[PDB]
């Protein structure tokens, strides 16, 4: 009717906005939107810091390059954001922290290109060593 679509989205968090015109809907992992820690599940008793828009905003990491020889890439969270603005500062000044995330992976090309990237979010992504 108005033309709203699965493929066309806008995400706004803090002072940052993402737009996309070729999305394939979006995933909410295990059907659970992020939330603050409920009192009935709480554990440290000190009044928590909640940075809100200072840290809950889009941070863009260094771009990588996909070629025919690429085997794949990995990042860990919160680690990949450890040096990101006030999120990073609040993380390092406190013993404890919790956080959810919106992850937006971007990769455009053309109607004459082809290829497919699996983007997986893995809880406790333990990786194997080299020894």
């Amino acid at each position: 009717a108005c033309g709203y679509s699965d493929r066309v989205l806008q995400l706004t968090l803090g002072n940052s906005t993402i737009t996309t015109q070729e999305a394939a809907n979006s995933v909410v992992a295990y059907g659970r939107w992020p939330e603050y820690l409920r009192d009935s599940e709480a554990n440290p008793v000190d009044q928590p810091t909640e940075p809100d828009v200072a840290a809950c905003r889009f941070y863009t990491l260094d771009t990588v390059s996909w070629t025919k020889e690429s085997r794949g890439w990995w990042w860990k969270l919160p680690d990949a954001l450890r040096d990101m603005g006030l999120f990073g500062q609040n993380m390092y000044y406190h013993y404890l922290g919790r956080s959810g995330y919106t992850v937006h992976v971007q990769c455009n090309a053309s109607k004459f290109h082809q290829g497919a990237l699996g983007v997986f979010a893995v809880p406790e992504m333990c990786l194997a060593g080299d020894s």
């Binding site: 009192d39 709480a42 008793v45 000190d46 009044q47």
Partner: protein, 50 residues
């Protein structure tokens, strides 16, 4: 002894406490068999001097 809790000296959030002292009641602290002795006995041949 000064009966303080954390909200007396820092800012605190609300927390619904679920822990209990069930395992440190006097009964539970002592609810175990402990070895108090080892007694030795034997059954020797009838020809023993001992």
């Amino acid at each position: 002894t000064n009966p303080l809790v954390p909200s007396d000296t820092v800012q605190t959030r609300h927390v619904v406490q679920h822990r209990s002292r069930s395992e440190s009641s006097i009964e539970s602290f002592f609810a175990r068999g402990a070895c108090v002795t080892i007694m030795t006995v034997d059954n020797p041949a009838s020809t023993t001097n001992k």
